Assembly symmetry: none
Homo-oligomer: 363 residues x 4
């Protein structure tokens, strides 16, 4: 649904400039990021001998945080912040160097003599793809972190000044996806217990989670343990997955939305304890309203889903991340004290967990 017109071998994406002088081919549009390493963007560019004659072609990788652009603002408020930039010359063959990777190696000996490789690496202090669009009930414009690959040809002129025509260039908007670190090791269970003293008699709530990290689509088995030693009854038990977004660059916007839930009108009277095991699966398809939450792509694109929990590297400033995504489990019990209105009291707690994509697989 998103653009990047393929051509099969296995699956390679291409884009020609209006100029038709330069064409860019990429192995994929989504690049893996597993804390320790991050897939480099290797590919090739098909040039037109005479069209690119006299000029040179380049390819660049740029990460930028945006805020405002493409938004009905009474006073057009926009802000961009570059978090990374790297450029390489792809046309005039630099050095005797060639297809450092197999992808470009086969692509070259499959496209022609006018095919040249390029390789742009990602640093380890960059956030992953994050996007947000304020719902109607939300305040604060939309923002996000884009990763753009750009192939462009530059020629010089008499007036002693170079030119970078839009026509002779291609713009590819790739995405950086978060994947569980390779070789992690077994993980404990997310524990937690609370003691709500009502009239000094206590109402205990204990929440348990199998692992600390869950994959997108993977069911989350939440175990609730309510030990009602009070005189009141727990009329209901609500268990929902909450996503917490935190803009940390242009304006400190804040969001907490439910991306999964499962409520039940249970019954836990005095001197009685109950233990249930629910299962929730937070997905973007869960709700029709995609506004207000933090996705990894455009609200319209098909291959777009919920963003993965942010993973700030040791020693890095969180603001450099632009937007911060996190997940947790909220369990609210509706206690009932029939007398005045203590029967409305709804206590709650939360247990944090991480959400991301399946570990990477080796050859």
């Amino acid at each position: 649904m998103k653009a990047n017109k393929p051509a099969p071998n296995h699956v390679i994406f291409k884009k020609i400039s209006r100029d038709k002088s330069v064409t860019i081919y990429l192995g994929k549009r989504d690049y893996i990021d597993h804390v320790e390493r991050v897939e480099p963007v290797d590919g090739v560019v098909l040039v037109d001998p005479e069209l690119v004659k006299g000029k040179r072609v380049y390819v660049s990788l740029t990460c930028a945080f945006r805020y405002g652009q493409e938004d009905i603002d009474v006073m057009g408020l926009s802000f961009r912040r570059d978090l990374y930039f790297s450029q390489v010359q792809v046309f005039p063959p630099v050095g005797a160097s060639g297809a450092t990777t197999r992808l470009q190696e086969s692509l070259i000996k499959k496209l022609g003599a006018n095919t040249y490789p390029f390789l742009l690496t990602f640093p380890d202090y960059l956030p992953c793809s994050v996007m947000l669009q304020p719902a109607p009930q939300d305040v604060g414009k939309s923002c996000g972190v884009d990763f753009e690959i750009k192939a462009f040809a530059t020629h010089s002129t008499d007036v002693e000044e170079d030119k970078i025509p839009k026509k002779s260039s291609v713009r590819l908007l790739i995405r950086k996806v978060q994947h569980a670190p390779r070789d992690m090791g077994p993980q404990p269970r997310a524990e937690a217990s609370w003691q709500f003293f009502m009239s000094d008699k206590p109402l205990r709530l204990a929440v348990s989670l199998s692992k600390e990290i869950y994959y997108h689509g993977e069911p989350i088995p939440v175990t609730v343990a309510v030990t009602n030693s009070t005189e009141k009854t727990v009329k209901k038990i609500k268990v929902l997955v909450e996503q917490v977004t935190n803009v940390v660059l242009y304006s400190s916007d804040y969001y907490i939305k439910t991306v999964a839930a499962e409520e039940a009108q249970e019954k836990v009277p005095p001197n009685s304890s109950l233990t249930k095991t629910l299962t929730l699966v937070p997905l973007l398809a869960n709700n029709r309203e995609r506004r207000g939450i933090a996705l990894d792509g455009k609200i319209k694109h098909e291959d777009t889903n919920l963003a993965s929990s942010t993973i700030i590297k040791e020693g890095i400033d969180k603001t450099v991340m632009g937007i911060l995504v996190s997940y947790q489990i909220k369990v609210k019990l509706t206690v009932s004290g029939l007398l005045g209105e203590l029967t409305s009291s709804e206590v709650a707690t939360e247990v944090p967990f991480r959400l991301m994509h399946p570990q990477p697989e080796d050859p």
Copy 2:
């Protein structure tokens, strides 16, 4: 318990002067004030043909702020300030005019030929009935705003000077009560946050109220939401209705008294959010101590209750109100940091609201 000796038809109050020459009848003693309009004081006066012979009778409406020993002194004791005065001639029939209202119309054709009507209107820049009496622990004398209707006969003398004998006159102390208009402001909401010494986590308190205006006697459902992300524990939660009086005429006296209170009994352990819904009803009967607060009548009278929130009209000077009454909800949390004494720290916030009497039941349904 308050005086104004009735006589039934439905319920009409009467008062004869010592002179027995003039008698005043009033439909009621409490007149409605719903921001947009205010019930006019219509009634009649029964005169004695020969006793009122040669002289004329009048009726007057006067609003005055007092500040001294006796808040009824119709002349002077400490400090008085007239906020309004209007007078009309009731005896010698002025014009062919007659019972402009049904009340006086039936009252006249039920009392006699010596019964004459009168009608005194209220302006829209006057405060309502407010009274205060300093408690022992209070400083500053008692004060209030009185509304007095007065029927009196005046005759002239040889020395070229008129006389207004006390005996040939009646003094009625009516009251102006506040009733809900038609539209009330937004839903009362407040949000507080605290970061204590040596702590990097917040303690949030959110207060919610159903409506912005509540009637006297109507229960106020307060919803408290404490999100304790701190290391300490909220040992207690106090919710009370506070009345704030502010004398603004002779001396800027100030008062804040609790007219209702609730101790929601449950705590909020660290790293856990709690949400409770209490219900308080501020009433005068709530406490035996009626000294120090702002009532709408005398501290002794039965039909006396708490004063309604002041409603200053647009463009009017607050000082013209004499005394200013207001209400709010105070929620204090007793946090506890076991170490030095941070365990005594008691944070608090308030959410204002309006209190008055039920909207006027005049939706055209009442066929008088």
Copy 3:
């Protein structure tokens, strides 16, 4: 330069059919469209008694979007879409009706007994005159929205079928021009900020425009405010008026051309703010290249200029407009970070505005 041979009284255009049987006269060739209302096309037709004997004459108004080789093809060449059609009978006098307007009234009593009036109105959901011709560097054929008035005579034949000879008919290609209504939106304002790689200081750009609507030829005073808190220097400041065309009927073609530009010559050193006020006037005469932009007439005609900003009426589908014209102001700053090539970075922003013709001079002052 465009045809419609006049004849003075003030200025009236005429056209005779080859047949010489019918002649059409029009008060003008350009009709005003000010959002609320749109000038009706009134005029008269001069017929030749015997030449038009036995047959009837009509006049029709038709709005059509074309997309092909010749944007005048009254039948079909590539793609045509009728957006409106209305016809009236002008020869055999329908009803006792006559010159509903003064124009036809004087024209009739100045031409003869063979002069008959007609009046065709415009609906309020039609676009104005828009034309486009792809430049060499452009892709997508030419298109446009034509408004055609047609006077034609129809007679019948033995074979039971009517005939509409081309010879006995006239084709007038009028145009609908956009004129300011009465109220224009808020003052155009924009604010941008940039933080470049390895830099922690912001670069602010604020753009201001006097009004929201400007007339053709009227100078546009753009005020730029650059607050360079960065380490780099703004070597250049470019301010240009951009026209954005959007074909929305047969094929979604897209255009963005510069119809005005100014190179304010002054720089903004680091840690120093600068505020300049440029003035641009977007006109068709501005550039020799008229290909690729959206005009209101033929690329050759003299009285042809830039099209006015489209004004889609509330509740109407934009596609019904055929082509969409809009204007804006683009301000690009050429920052310079001497190190790798951050010195090439050219940031930019835009502020939209409306362009059209002077408000209709119909304030009751004009006594026609």
Copy 4:
């Protein structure tokens, strides 16, 4: 104008609780803060033998940042943040200790046997007194940093719980004033030069300041040097002192107000250079509008003036300061290029400087 009813010896402030059980005396209400050290708050409390019988009395120092309180907020938004707290027991004589300072020593042997001393010190990571009240054209509630001394008596009850009646306590709102460090050493001049190239021909502006630190009330001699090598003329020269406030705790509010100014319609045509020396003195009395700027006290109090430049100590987090005050000199030149409207172009620059109170004087 501010309260703290004195009693002469030299000048000592007193305040009795409603309870009349405790009375607090303070040497002064404004305590000096010269980067290296900060005046400790020493004083005494006069108790009533039987009224304080059975209970103990204490005195505490507390620094807190506020935001919102006492403001017409549609949804009462308030926030308090404690930056420091220290408490001492003043009634039951702790240890054989006594008047550590002369102040309390004379005060005691001048008040009675019911007079007890106390001493509360200030840490070196606290901001000074700062207050702000948004003007009508301003957005964001009012805030500030308060320093409160509190004397209160506490007694216990049957229900096993202590009580701290409001009546038996006094609240003193002292202020921490910034004074130039003692023994600084000579300071250079605040220099700066800029080059505005118009059509490649330059227009130079150089600003000079005598010292780097100025005292409140002290005249600031600004020297402007315009070297107009351009074709246009500098029709005007504006020199103003700007105060820059920056809320850094509850919400990042921002302010820039002119607290002094001196404009002149000078004339500097092509190939000509001009050098002027203006003198501005930023004071609170300068303008009637005290709303929108950062003072050191209440907008109503007499002894209230402009806040001093913030001095963040090495290694401390600026957010801990609550509000950040700073000063600078802005010089805007109104150049005129008669042709289109280049004659409106108004260039500008700024030179920062510090503002505070006179150095401290030793015995």
